[PDB]
Structure formats: C-alpha cells, structure tokens
Design a protein around this ligand. Structure first.
Ligand SMILES: [Mg+2]
Ligand SMILES: [Mg+2]
Ligand SMILES: [Mg+2]
Ligand SMILES: [Mg+2]
Ligand SMILES: [Mg+2]
Ligand SMILES: [Mg+2]
Ligand SMILES: [Mg+2]
Ligand SMILES: [Mg+2]
Ligand SMILES: [Mg+2]
Ligand SMILES: [Mg+2]
Ligand SMILES: [Mg+2]
Ligand SMILES: [Mg+2]
Ligand SMILES: [Mg+2]
Ligand SMILES: [Mg+2]
Ligand SMILES: [Mg+2]
Ligand SMILES: [Mg+2]
Ligand SMILES: [Mg+2]
Ligand SMILES: [Mg+2]
Ligand SMILES: [Mg+2]
Ligand SMILES: [Mg+2]
Ligand SMILES: [Mg+2]
Ligand SMILES: [Mg+2]
Ligand SMILES: [Mg+2]
Ligand SMILES: [Mg+2]
Ligand SMILES: [Mg+2]
Ligand SMILES: [Mg+2]
Ligand SMILES: [Mg+2]
Ligand SMILES: [Mg+2]
Ligand SMILES: [Mg+2]
Ligand SMILES: [Mg+2]
Ligand SMILES: [Mg+2]
Ligand SMILES: [Mg+2]
Ligand SMILES: [Mg+2]
Ligand SMILES: [Mg+2]
Ligand SMILES: [Mg+2]
Ligand SMILES: [Mg+2]
Ligand SMILES: [Mg+2]
Ligand SMILES: [Mg+2]
Ligand SMILES: [Mg+2]
Ligand SMILES: [Mg+2]
Ligand SMILES: [Mg+2]
Ligand SMILES: [Mg+2]
Ligand SMILES: [Mg+2]
Ligand SMILES: [Mg+2]
Ligand SMILES: [Mg+2]
Ligand SMILES: [Mg+2]
Ligand SMILES: [Mg+2]
Ligand SMILES: [Mg+2]
Ligand SMILES: [Mg+2]
Lengths: 193, 99, 51, 148, 203
RNA sequence: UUGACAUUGUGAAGAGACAUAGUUUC
RNA sequence: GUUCUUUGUAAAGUGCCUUCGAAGAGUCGAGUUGUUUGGGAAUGCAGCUCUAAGUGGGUGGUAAAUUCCAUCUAAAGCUAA
RNA sequence: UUGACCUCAAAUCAGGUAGGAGUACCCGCUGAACUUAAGCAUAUCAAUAAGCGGAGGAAAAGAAACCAACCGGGAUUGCCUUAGUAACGGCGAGUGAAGCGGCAAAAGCUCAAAUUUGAAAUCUGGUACCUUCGGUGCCCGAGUUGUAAUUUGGAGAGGG
C-alpha cells in the first residue's frame, strides 16, 4: 500500500463517514425560501428597512487593520455625542453596543457623523398611528455605505532626511531585544555600593 | 502610550489621536464597600478563627513568617493567597494582642 | 452523493453562447439544424418591435 | 463515462487485466502507509526522504496572521499605480511631485528588490524593506516612508 | 438586611459555631428518609439568591446521595475486551452528586419543575442537598411574569437534560478556548466536524 | 490485605517543641 | 381605519452638583486519581483531600519566583431568527 | 382548663399534575468489539453500535469571568474559509481543532445582595355578582424566617 512516486495523501475516511454526508440539493430551494422570508419581513416590517444602522470600526489584528468594516453597534459614547440616548436610538433602527469602546477619535467622529447623516435622512412617524404612508427603502447599509478613509494625497514632495528605513528597523528591533539586559546592567550598576 | 508609528520595535504601531473611554464599573467588581467591610469584620469576631488559621499564627509567633507561608501555600491554593493570608494573620496579631 | 451538476468557467460559458449566437446568422447552419427557412427573406431575421 | 472505460474492453477476458498468477486480492501490501519502515522503505527513502522522526521546535497555538507579510519586488511596484496615472509619472519624474505608493494599502508587507526601476522618483510607503529595496529606490531619488 | 450576614457567615464552615451546627444537622438529616420534604430552607439566603421566593408554588426538597466513585457494574470485574478498558475501580462518573440529587427528587415530584439546588452538608457516606422546585400549575406561578417561563413544556425535567446549573457545568457549556470541545454541546459539535459537505457545484 | 487522610467528638494521666508557665501533637 | 372610557393629584426621558455604589462559597483555586481532548509540566468532566479573597477574582495554550501589562466580571436566570 | 406555634401525619378531603407511546432530527448518561496498524498490547475503529434517562417543532446555545495583543473586536447558531494546518501520535498506523476575514440571520435582557417602615404597598383559594383566556366585593388563607414597587454593573441608588 505504498508505491510509485506519488504524494502522501491524507483522506480521513476511516469512520462511518457515509452516515454524515450533507449534499446541498436544497441549495436552490433554500435560496428561494430565504428570499420569500425577506419579502415577508419587509412587508410585515411596515416602511422600516430590513436592517439597522451599523458603525464603522477598524478591524482587528495585524493582517486586517488596514481596512475598516461595519461594527456591531454604536457605543454609549457615540450615541450620547450624536444627541440621543440609547433606549431611543434602539427604536429608531440604530444599533447600539454597550461592549465597544472609544480610543480612536478619528473613528469616534466617523461614527458620530454617521449618526448625524442617518437622523437627517430618516423620518419618524408619530405614535398617534395616523400613518402618513411613505415608501420603504430596504437597506440602511446600502444608503449609508462604509468607505475606506483616504490616508494621503497622490503625489507630494520627496523628503529624505538621510537616515535609512531599513536601518531604522534593525535598530528598532535591537533596542527592544536588549531592552531587558540593559535594564539589568543599570539595576546591578546601582548596587555598586 | 504613544505608538512609534513603525511596524516593529518598542512602542510598535499606528499613531492615532487617542481618547481613553469613560470607565466601566464592572471594572470595579472587586472593590470593598463600607457595608461589606463592616459585616465581614463583624462576622470575624463572632465566629473567631478556624483550625488552620490558629495553627498559622502560632507558626508565625513561634517559627517565623517564611515557614508560615510555606504551610499556608499547601493549605490554601497557592503562594499568592498564602502571601495574603499570612498578612491577614499578621494584622490579627498586631491589632489584637499588641496595640 | 454522486456528482450531478457541473461547473464550467464562466468565461468559457460565454465563448460558447457567443459562438452559438453567431451561428444563428449563418443560414446553412440554420438549415442544417432542421428549421425551414428557404422561404425567409434574410438572416438574421429582424422583425418589428411592435411584436 | 462508463462508455469510454477500460473495463468495458476487459469484458470477455478472464482476469480483468489483473493477471492470472498474481490476481487482484484485497490488501497485499497491508493497508495505507503500512510498513513504511519495513517492506515499503525502499519507496520511502527516495521519493520521500525526510519522512520519519522530527526537526525543530513545536509552537503551541501558532496564529498564522501574526506572520502576515506578503512580498512585492521592485520588479513590480510601478504596477500598484493605475495604468493611465502611471505613464503620467514616468515622464515628469521629479521631487516636489512624486507618486505616493501605499504598498500596505495594496496589501503588501515588505518590499524586496528584484530588479531595475526607472530613474523616476517614487515615494514608497511600506512596513518593511530589503536593504537593497530601499537602496535602489533611493538611487532613483525616491525614498521609503515607514508605516503601520 | 440579614442575608448579607448569613452569606458571609456561611463561608466560615470550619468556624466553631458552624461545626457545631453542622454536626447536629447532619445527624438529623441522616435519620430521616433519603428523600424528604423540607419545611423551609435551612439556608434562606442561598435559596433566594438561586431563584427561591416565599410564595405558594415554591417547594424545597432535601435529598442525600452516596459519595465516592462509580464502581463499574459487571460481574466479578470481568470486562471482556482490551486492557485500557479493564478498569472497574478508579472509574469516576461525569455528572455531579448534585445532579443525582436533583434527578431523584425531580422523579419523586414529576408535577414540579426543578429550578436549582444547593449543598448543605456531608459525612463520609453521603452528601446532602436542598433542591428548590416550582409548581408550574400553581396560578401564583403561572401568573408572575418572572417565573412563568418555567411553565413552558421545554423545561420538562430540566435536571434530566443537564439544563440546571450543575448540568450546564458538567456539560461543559462555557465560552472560550478551554471549551472548544463541549460548548455548543460536544456531541453536536463533534458531528459537525465529521460531516461531509458536498455542494451541487463541487468546492 | 496493609498504611494514610476524611467520617471524629469529651475528660485524665504519660511522653513530645518557642528552648522547667500551656496553644499543639502523638 | 374607525368608536368609547382618559388611565392622573399616576408614570417615564434628559442636564448639573454631592455622597454612595450592597454584585452568587464546600464555590473559585489547589493536590491527587480516572476519563477525555488537537491542548503538549496536563483541553473539559468527575471522585476523594485541602480550601480563598475583595485595589479581589478568572483568562492571557511551557512548569516556577519576582515585577508589570492587557482583558473580562464566575460560582443564579430568560430569550425569536 | 383554655388558645397559639413548630414539626410531623390522615382523609374516596377541594382542585390539579406525572406515568405510556413515538423518537428522523435534539439534550444527557453509559459504553463495546470486529477493524486498521500487514503480528500486537498504547493507539485506531469511536468519545461510534448496542443499553439507560429527558424535550420540542425544532432542540441546544446565547448577551462575555469571550476573542485578542490590533488603529483592536464585541451575545448565540450556521455556511465559505482558516486546514488536512497549530497540535497530538508504539512521533508508527493514524489523528486534528481555534482566533481573524466573507456571508445567512439579527435582539435584547431578569434576579440575588437595599428600611415601604408615615403604614405587605404582594398573592392561591372559597364565595357572591359581572361585560368570564378575565373583573370587582367580601371572607378564610399565604407571607415579615420577606410577598410588591425601586436597582442589575452598560450601571445604579440617596440627598441638592
Ligand atoms: Mg471527513
Ligand atoms: Mg437532507
Ligand atoms: Mg438582513
Ligand atoms: Mg393608529
Ligand atoms: Mg472516473
Ligand atoms: Mg457512458
Ligand atoms: Mg465502447
Ligand atoms: Mg483488451
Ligand atoms: Mg484485444
Ligand atoms: Mg471482449
Ligand atoms: Mg489477453
Ligand atoms: Mg492492468
Ligand atoms: Mg483468476
Ligand atoms: Mg507468486
Ligand atoms: Mg510522520
Ligand atoms: Mg516577481
Ligand atoms: Mg407552604
Ligand atoms: Mg467489552
Ligand atoms: Mg484507558
Ligand atoms: Mg457516616
Ligand atoms: Mg476536539
Ligand atoms: Mg471536482
Ligand atoms: Mg456575579
Ligand atoms: Mg466514559
Ligand atoms: Mg486531565
Ligand atoms: Mg505564573
Ligand atoms: Mg476590548
Ligand atoms: Mg429568575
Ligand atoms: Mg379529592
Ligand atoms: Mg416517557
Ligand atoms: Mg466508548
Ligand atoms: Mg467494519
Ligand atoms: Mg478500518
Ligand atoms: Mg491487526
Ligand atoms: Mg492482516
Ligand atoms: Mg490477530
Ligand atoms: Mg479514545
Ligand atoms: Mg445508541
Ligand atoms: Mg409534540
Ligand atoms: Mg417556541
Ligand atoms: Mg426555523
Ligand atoms: Mg431554547
Ligand atoms: Mg437556555
Ligand atoms: Mg452582562
Ligand atoms: Mg461573536
Ligand atoms: Mg501521517
Ligand atoms: Mg479521536
Ligand atoms: Mg465574521
Ligand atoms: Mg427579549
């Protein structure tokens, strides 16, 4: 059961795997159903749109933080700033998130302005029930896209101060590496009576 | 902090105009309270010490504060609580039988 | 769990349909295919939008 | 399709092209990767030197991402400027106005130096650089601006 | 309030006043039946922080279960099988003695729902528990927006499915890296991981 | 089967240490 | 969409100032045994023994001592898609 | 002598509830060996089959004692990916997950711990009447060993 110059394979089929084969024959079916659901919801949901306002948020980790991406909800700070309280914001189709925090002002502003836009661009019918019927726009998200912030201009003057990029990295790397050692050198050199 | 703005090194990362958020109370789940302080102090002089606590202060009185920890670390979980427990006993002794 | 459908590259799906459209002109082809078009004026046959 | 398959052709011969003498039986070699170090070792040293035993250090809970850092050689670089905008800069190559290229934004992590970029000045924004990368860039009168 | 005192006091189990009480109470219980109705909580502060309330419809049962390992049943220790499986005697049982406690009262009182349960005492042979129960046919309960969830049929014999807190404990229902196996519920998550997924247009 | 720990509490004599007051251990 | 009783000396939202700010124990945790896990000086679960604190506690995938940092708020509970 | 209380009983006492069935799917317990390793015990088959207890139209899970280590994210479930990877493993045969990213769907909250103390403000039942999935009057009863209102950490309470 080993021969030829072939790659070594790894087909995990040693359990009764045929008892857990999921073929998505229902692919077309579920899509249809998925679609109907949405048509019911929009209908039922009166003029309201099918989603809620989500915040901008910088993504996490080294790999994704170049991009920005819809968050969960707006943060009690952002809501306050934008001139409304959390309870109400929740009834106006804005998503709020007691978990998220503000440390970056650029994003904080972003969101507060995101909220200002929204408020101006929505219309809240009175409680009375008098219902001045007025046209369903379906996606909050479509209407208030989330674009990537522009981080510079296109062309600009070349300023070369002289010290090289590469070397600044090696030097930076270094300083961190021996950071502890040199602290022990300085600690110990104090105990020179 | 302030980040250096480059991709390695000591304060690695992007400079951002910073903010520092309103503080969470859930960040204060540990804190005392004058209610809890009082109750606990009261229960203590009601119930008294317990067998391992009595042995503990003897051990302190009669054998030092390092061998007190060594026992108390086996008794309780670990060295940190044992630290903390000898301390409490130390301040039963001072408070009481001294000043 | 036999494979029933097949995936063709979208681009090449288009090469074929484009190909297929072009042949609906070429009247020899249309004739060859069944299709009784000796009577029909010209090919491509374009009729009015009023249809 | 069954139609074009060799078993259709073997119908009528006794042994299905598996041989009278040595048959086709269940698992003569054993199953799987069995016998790696014994009756199948000739095939494993050659074809697969290096298969058995260990090398370096284990790394518990390694998170690929941590090490995310695609490379782009000077080789390209000019590709990261849109076609039309590009010729604009190649001619009229200068300080005072030289193209900014945010290689991070283009989804790269380090610039390496594979070869020859015209003497147009570029402003190159990256997370890391090849010592040559930076060197060559400078020789065109551009620089590298370290980011994050 | 007094409960705060109660709470703190109950954490001094090796304190003189408590070992007295403990000693008497644990003999009293051991004289009664292994399952017996309790007139009231003997820990009114534990009970109440666990969902109890002193209105009609709320019931306390006191039960004692045997301690120690699970001796694997099987005649004469014979295991008939491989040697990793020959154990009989250091074998330990995945639910808690508290689960067994809940489950026996719950059986004894099918017309109640088990709500929760707390430890009260032990000796070398038994651990003792008080189990707090609810009558979901009692209108005092059926009304009452806060406890009437327990009135739904999904909550039939919660203790038998490990939906009480002890059950949730041993079922390993918690968020995090330490709970990967068992968290959306281990048997169900295992199945997921060993399901083949073929699409119409194969991926 | 043998030991330890837990179930385990109360006196008295005798040994054991801060090193010939009584907390503690046999 | 209409129509009748106004629930009221009722209930709720918001700004500033001052003082407070109660938060789950034979549990957390620890040793050991067994099982289990991809989890490796030990992923979860259980048995027996030990058994906490409150500027505490848990987690931070190599054991330990020291010093910091980050991040949540356990041991009670409901909940559509 | 009389009346309470605590705890424990009886009744064909007034009204109710549980059992059994089904079990494709769901939540638990318990638990194999054939097999694979070309022999075999660890391993594997498999946290599978058989046995046991328990639900529903779904069940479970769920508003972080989470993930991270970033410019940080933000309940749960599922799909595409991560990945046949980190890791485990007579390091043999074999095994084997998670974080980020895209998508489906979206939803958030309740107690405990608090002196109403210028008024237990709360509730089962019986009863009569009614406009009966309920309401009001009254009476037994529950309940202070605490039933309501208020508060849930995002907070929040008391005074101004
Ligand atoms: Mg498979
Ligand atoms: Mg199907
Ligand atoms: Mg949607
Ligand atoms: Mg209306
Ligand atoms: Mg074929
Ligand atoms: Mg064919
Ligand atoms: Mg043929
Ligand atoms: Mg032939
Ligand atoms: Mg031939
Ligand atoms: Mg033939
Ligand atoms: Mg032949
Ligand atoms: Mg052949
Ligand atoms: Mg033959
Ligand atoms: Mg031969
Ligand atoms: Mg190998
Ligand atoms: Mg290249
Ligand atoms: Mg009663
Ligand atoms: Mg067997
Ligand atoms: Mg074994
Ligand atoms: Mg006994
Ligand atoms: Mg696993
Ligand atoms: Mg294919
Ligand atoms: Mg808590
Ligand atoms: Mg087992
Ligand atoms: Mg283990
Ligand atoms: Mg440590
Ligand atoms: Mg955070
Ligand atoms: Mg509750
Ligand atoms: Mg009757
Ligand atoms: Mg049944
Ligand atoms: Mg098994
Ligand atoms: Mg088989
Ligand atoms: Mg097999
Ligand atoms: Mg074999
Ligand atoms: Mg064989
Ligand atoms: Mg054999
Ligand atoms: Mg196994
Ligand atoms: Mg079965
Ligand atoms: Mg049904
Ligand atoms: Mg339902
Ligand atoms: Mg559904
Ligand atoms: Mg549910
Ligand atoms: Mg639930
Ligand atoms: Mg919370
Ligand atoms: Mg999440
Ligand atoms: Mg392999
Ligand atoms: Mg396995
Ligand atoms: Mg995602
Ligand atoms: Mg809700």
């Amino acid at each position: 059961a080993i021969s030829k110059n072939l790659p070594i394979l790894k087909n995990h089929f040693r359990k009764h795997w045929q008892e857990r084969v999921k073929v998505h024959f229902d692919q077309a079916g579920k899509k249809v159903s998925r679609r109907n659901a949405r048509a019911t919801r929009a209908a039922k949901i009166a003029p309201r749109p099918l989603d809620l306002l989500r915040p901008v948020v910088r993504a996490p980790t080294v790999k994704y933080n170049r991009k920005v991406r819809a968050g969960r909800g707006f943060t009690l700070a952002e809501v306050k700033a934008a001139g409304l309280t959390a309870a109400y914001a929740r009834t106006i189709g804005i998503a709020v998130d007691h978990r998220r925090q503000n440390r970056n002002q650029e994003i904080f502003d972003a969101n507060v302005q995101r909220l200002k836009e929204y408020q101006s661009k929505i219309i809240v019918f009175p409680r009375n029930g008098k219902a001045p019927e007025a046209e369903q726009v379906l996606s909050a998200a479509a209407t208030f896209p989330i674009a990537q912030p522009a981080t510079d201009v296109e062309a600009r003057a070349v300023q070369d101060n002289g010290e090289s990029a590469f070397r600044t990295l090696r030097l930076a790397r270094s300083e961190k590496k021996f950071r502890g050692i040199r602290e022990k050198r300085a600690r110990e050199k104090a105990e020179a009576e | 902090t302030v980040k250096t703005g480059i991709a390695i090194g000591l304060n690695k990362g992007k400079k951002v105009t910073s903010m520092t958020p309103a503080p969470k109370i859930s960040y204060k789940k540990g804190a005392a309270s004058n209610r809890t302080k009082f109750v606990r102090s009261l229960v203590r002089e009601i119930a008294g010490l317990s067998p391992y606590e009595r042995r503990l202060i003897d051990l302190i009185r009669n054998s030092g504060e390092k061998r007190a920890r060594k026992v108390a670390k086996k008794r309780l979980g670990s060295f940190t609580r044992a630290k903390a427990k000898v301390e409490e006993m130390n301040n039963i002794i001072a408070a009481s039988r001294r000043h | 769990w036999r494979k029933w459908n097949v995936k063709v590259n979208h681009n090449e799906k288009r090469y074929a349909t484009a190909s297929a459209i072009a042949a609906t002109a070429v009247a020899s082809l249309v004739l060859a295919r069944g299709h009784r078009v000796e009577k029909i004026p010209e090919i491509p046959l374009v009729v009015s939008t009023d249809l | 399709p069954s139609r074009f398959t060799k078993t259709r052709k073997h119908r009528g011969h006794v042994s299905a092209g598996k041989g009278r003498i040595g048959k086709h039986r269940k698992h003569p070699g054993g199953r799987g990767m069995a016998g790696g170090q014994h009756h199948h070792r000739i095939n494993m040293d050659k074809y697969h030197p290096g298969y058995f035993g260990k090398v370096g250090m284990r790394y518990f809970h390694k998170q690929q991402a941590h090490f995310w850092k695609p490379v782009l050689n000077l080789d390209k670089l000019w590709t990261l400027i849109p076609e039309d905008k590009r010729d604009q800069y190649l001619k009229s190559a200068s300080k005072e106005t030289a193209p900014v290229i945010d290689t991070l934004a283009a989804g790269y992590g380090k610039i390496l130096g594979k070869g020859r970029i015209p003497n147009v000045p570029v402003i190159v924004k990256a997370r890391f650089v090849s010592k040559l990368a930076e060197e060559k860039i400078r020789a065109a009168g551009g620089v590298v601006e370290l980011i994050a | 309030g007094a409960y705060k005192y109660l709470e703190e006091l109950q954490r001094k189990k090796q304190s003189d006043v408590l070992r007295f009480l403990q000693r008497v109470r644990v003999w009293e219980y051991r004289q009664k039946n292994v399952i017996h109705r309790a007139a009231r909580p003997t820990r009114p502060d534990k009970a109440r922080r666990l969902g109890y309330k002193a209105k009609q419809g709320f019931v306390i049962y006191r039960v004692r279960v045997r301690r120690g390992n699970r001796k694997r049943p099987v005649p004469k220790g014979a295991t008939y099988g491989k040697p990793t499986n020959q154990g009989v005697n250091e074998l330990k049982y995945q639910r808690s003695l508290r689960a067994t406690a809940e489950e026996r009262v719950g059986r004894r009182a099918a017309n109640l729902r088990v709500l929760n349960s707390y430890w009260v005492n032990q000796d070398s042979t038994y651990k003792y528990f008080e189990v707090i129960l609810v009558d979901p046919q009692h209108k005092a309960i059926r009304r009452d927006a806060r406890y009437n969830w327990i009135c739904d049929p999904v909550h039939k014999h919660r203790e038998a499915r490990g939906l009480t807190a002890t059950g949730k404990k041993s079922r390993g229902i918690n968020k995090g890296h330490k709970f990967n196996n068992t968290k959306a519920g281990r048997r169900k998550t295992w199945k997921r991981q060993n399901t083949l997924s073929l699409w119409r247009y194969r991926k």
